[PDB]
């Protein structure tokens with residue numbers, strides 16, 4: 217049971233609001249779309265099909281009522297263009313900002329474009345929302361902002377030095393968010409995601425994330441590469457926690473805003489152990505090389521989510537095993 | 553005597569290099585131009601006449617040899633456009649990045665534009681320079697990055713929270729500079745200026761800085777406004793120190809790079825005392841209301857320059873009194 221969360225969703229189903237999801241055709245944004253439409257919300261969506269997909273929107277349309285779908289106004293556009301940002305704010309209540317170019321290697325090779333989308337694009341949305349005078353503003357931040365801090369698990373007040381352009385942009389989101397509270401009194405909630413996985417995470421690409429990259433390879437029968445000695449660990453977080461954490465935040469009490477919160481489960485799984493779980497779970501539906509680490513790669517990563525639990529009444533109900541199990545079917549359909 | 557500085561300038565007069573000054577029509581940039589051309593350097597200049605002036609370039613042309621001037625290639629352009637940034641890097645040895653929109657109030661009202669120039673513009677130049685593989689890279693940072701830290705004087709390792717969009721952009725310059733060291737091995741030197749004053753500082757404008765704002769008013773005979781109880785203090789720094797600090801840095805030894813340095817004198821003058829010195833010095837060439845503080849205004853400000861003195865052999869030779877005295881004549885000519 218996710219109790220506060222249940223309570224919040226009930227409220228919404230009755231007094232429906234207008235939401236704006238940027239990066240709505242992406243993995244996390246499309247997940248949020250699914251959930252919000254099922255709660256009969258009015259949604260305005262923004263994506264520029266950089267890393268997002270029209271097919272992700274399509275799939276969502278097959279998962280929801282057609283009266284539910286009628287409430288979605290999709291917009292093909294760029295958060296990089298301030299004018300778009302403003303047209304799309306009209307009448308919005310809650311903002312869920314997910315639009316950004318992710319990935320550490322990507323920023324390392326083209327920082328200019330990453331900067332433009334993640335900082336210029338972020339500030340645009342943030343400003344537009346301030347002026348539109350929305351009721352809440354929740355944005356995607358990154359566990360990467362911890363950088364070289366050696367503490368495990370990671371606690372929000374203690375970050376170190378950023379180790380890549382990507383980490384910087386995300387840190388810069390937070391800093392801007394704070395200054396906006398100081399100078400306009402406009403209160404946000406930033407979520408430091410930690411390695412989210414689940415349905416509709418792109419397994420194709422040079423920047424494919426690990427769980428969907430391995431899963432696709434274990435099916436095609438291709439090699440499975442482990443970038444390093446295979447001891448690196450992470451706090452893998454199923455989408456349903458992230459979806460939960462977004463809603464808790466959009467409707468959070470004012471004293472909880474202007475805050476940064478880790479979004480994860482509190483556990484730690486190794487690149488070796490993961491390969492275990494991904495296989496065990498895939499052969500229950502009937503179907504390993506080593507290399508160097510990456511430049512900018514992180515050694516150990518585990519979150520402390522007590523802040524979330526405390527102030528927002530968060531409930532990480534789905535740990536990694538179950539999460540993989542709820543996921544693999546989606547990748548079979550998608551990979552046939 | 554400025555001994556290491558003297559030593560450096562001799563070297564240059566012999567093995568002249570190609571320099572790039574952004575914000576070269578501005579106050580600090582035009583001052584750097586004057587100095588570099590007098591040392592027979594080759595200078596490529598970039599400004600977009602946002603806050604800079606063609607007349608500032610003109611004045612410089614009357615202060616220097618015409619063989620000296622022939623070595624200046626001026627370019628009307630924007631650091632916001634990456635392509636410009638690259639054409640201008642061709643063959644450059646030392647970069648002196650001064651192009652930015654200054655002022656705390658200005659960022660508070662239009663953060664989007666401030667963001668674009670100070671971060672996007674900064675990143676462009678920094679990237680361009682990395683690829684061009686220059687020999688040095690020195691950029692204008694801000695004492696504002698101390699934010700809400702209560703220590704006096706201020707010491708580079710200890711900063712607090714930024715209190716305005718402006719402060720954020722400048723802080724973000726530093727962070728980027730560092731990450732560039734980590735990830736490409738490209739070593740910079742950031743200078744945290746502290747309230748620079750001297751010849752060619754625009755006394756006109758809503759955002760005019762204090763010393764030229766008061767000086768122009770004391771001549772026109774207008775009122776002189778003191779934003780607050782007139783106890784606020786600052787470390788006023790004459791340009792010749794900042795000019796000195798830029799050169800020390802461009803030619804600094806590699807172990808001194810990837811560092812941030814305060815640029816100031818170490819002293820502290822009050823808004824009440826300043827009004828004293830500006831008058832005493834102006835009536836020796838023959839010619840007060842109170843209001844509220846500013847939002848984002850700072851209470852006390854004094855730098856610790858020992859790091860500069862240690863690692864770069866800096867010498868703050870000109871304190872405030874003398875500096876005002878060297879300045880007032882320029883404002884008479886300019887204000888007739």
Ligand SMILES: NC(=O)c1ccc[n+]([C@@H]2O[C@H](COP(=O)([O-])OP(=O)(O)OC[C@H]3O[C@@H](n4cnc5c(N)ncnc54)[C@H](O)[C@@H]3O)[C@@H](O)[C@H]2O)c1
Nearest residue numbers: 239241242243244263264267268294295314316356411412
């Ligand atoms: N996935 C993670 O582990 C993780 C970690 C930290 C932060 N985040 C943030 O989560 C958010 C979503 O991540 P994701 O994995 O779902 O990524 P994703 O690429 O799947 O989703 C990104 C979406 O961004 C949109 N987009 C990108 N740039 C845009 C622009 N300029 N204008 C309009 N739309 C644009 C596209 O429609 C795309 O669908 C991103 O902010 C990501 O940085 C994710």
Ligand SMILES: NC(=O)c1ccc[n+]([C@@H]2O[C@H](COP(=O)([O-])OP(=O)(O)OC[C@H]3O[C@@H](n4cnc5c(N)ncnc54)[C@H](O)[C@@H]3O)[C@@H](O)[C@H]2O)c1
Nearest residue numbers: 575577578579580600602603604630631651652692747748
């Ligand atoms: N003047 C000071 O006391 C002080 C204090 C702190 C920091 N600084 C920093 O020092 C640098 C110069 O200071 P200043 O007082 O001479 O300011 P300034 O206004 O005199 O100089 C700014 C110059 O940059 C140019 N510029 C602005 N945006 C540009 C763009 N997008 N592309 C190209 N050129 C652009 C302007 O035309 C102007 O010539 C700035 O980065 C400023 O932030 C100055």
